[PDB]
Swiss-Prot record, chain A:
The keyword Transferase applies. It catalyses: an acyl-CoA + acetate = a carboxylate + acetyl-CoA; acetoacetate + acetyl-CoA = acetoacetyl-CoA + acetate; butanoate + acetyl-CoA = butanoyl-CoA + acetate; acetoacetate + butanoyl-CoA = acetoacetyl-CoA + butanoate. This is Acetate CoA-transferase subunit alpha. It comes from the Bacteria. It comes from Escherichia coli (strain K12). The gene is atoD.
From Swiss-Prot, chain B:
It is an enzyme of class 2 (transferase). It catalyses: an acyl-CoA + acetate = a carboxylate + acetyl-CoA; acetoacetate + acetyl-CoA = acetoacetyl-CoA + acetate; butanoate + acetyl-CoA = butanoyl-CoA + acetate; acetoacetate + butanoyl-CoA = acetoacetyl-CoA + butanoate. This is Acetate CoA-transferase subunit alpha. The gene is atoD. SUPFAM superfamilies: NagB/RpiA/CoA transferase-like. It comes from the Bacteria. Its main location: cytoplasm. The lineage of its organism: Bacteria, Pseudomonadati, Pseudomonadota, Gammaproteobacteria, Enterobacterales. It is found in: Cytoplasm.
Amino acid sequence: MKTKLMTLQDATGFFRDGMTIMVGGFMGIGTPSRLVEALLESGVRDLTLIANDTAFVDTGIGPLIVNGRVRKVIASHIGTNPETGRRMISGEMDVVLVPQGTLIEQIRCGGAGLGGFLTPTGVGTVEGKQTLTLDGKTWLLERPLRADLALIRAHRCDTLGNLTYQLSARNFNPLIALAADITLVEPDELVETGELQPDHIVTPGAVIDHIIVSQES
Amino acid sequence: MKTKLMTLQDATGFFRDGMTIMVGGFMGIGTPSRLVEALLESGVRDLTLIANDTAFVDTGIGPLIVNGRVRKVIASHIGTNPETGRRMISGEMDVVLVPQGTLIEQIRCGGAGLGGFLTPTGVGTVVEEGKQTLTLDGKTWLLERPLRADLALIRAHRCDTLGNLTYQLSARNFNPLIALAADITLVEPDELVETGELQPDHIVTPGAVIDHIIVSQES
Ligand SMILES: [Mg+2]
Ligand SMILES: [Mg+2]
Ligand SMILES: [Mg+2]
Ligand SMILES: [Mg+2]
């Protein structure tokens, strides 16, 4: 048997306190909002969330933060969500701010199964990381980032999990699909295998574990 | 400089002795055939070629090798081309066999401006020879450096007049990868179309990294 097919109700079973979860979406755009809602309703806490940003208090992973479900955020920008900053300053939540280009490479590094990469980026800046001197230059050594789970939004998805995306909504989605131990997809459209043009598939079904089969109606 | 459009004859003007060239293709598939023919006809030599493999004696970059135009090959497989091995043994050609995943990441780093990366691939084996390892979190990793080239010869499926490209899955392989890691990029498209004709969601290689496009069709 072992189907990848499942419902939002089944999604609940994949959530547990303290897990690390990667979530797609750029400023809420391309965020698997239904999976995020299921995560919120599950009631799990002490989560570590990895995402491009914390969007707004009501979008992206904003609701999870506002409702106290998150212990740590790793993202590239939190300026548009005052609740993220507030919990950061109140000591209620740990926030690790990472430059976007570097955050993207760390997640890519984790999905590639590598041990780290050398960036010229951040040198002489704010430290805690080690430097490597190679040839004539100095480099900052950044480590890979992986997660227990990834919540992905896709445009089209076939029953095997091959995914395509719309430009704006793409962002972190294909990246995190490779860097999490278990991957859950919320597709705009679910179709039979063979229906997607192979030349345009972005994310291989091989890395997709579960697919939400319902439509928001 | 107000145009990326050119002919195969114009391609000859980019080939110089001793340059490093990245070439697309998987076992000969997805290789920009005509650009490689031009390269061979140009008679240039002492070249360093970077590709997934050395194909067969009569396909991909194989002819460039049999005709002594290559001093060094950096690839992940050379077994289907006996001439590569022969020249490696005789000392006629330098050959650096790189694990495929590693070769891919080296080229990706070259295109991304990174200084290198740590990989578990090859640690504790002959692949370590001549490189440094580094131990982090109790694990030992091999330090690999980025790869770039002077030129990249790319085969694309569809290409618009600005250089935006799409590929057929079966011929894609290294093409989009090398497009980002070379100083100058030349594309041999199956179909050249007007800008606006390609669906933006389907563009894989942005025209910004593409310098010249072959306009003629067929072999
Ligand atoms: Mg595509
Ligand atoms: Mg997996
Ligand atoms: Mg071979
Ligand atoms: Mg360029």
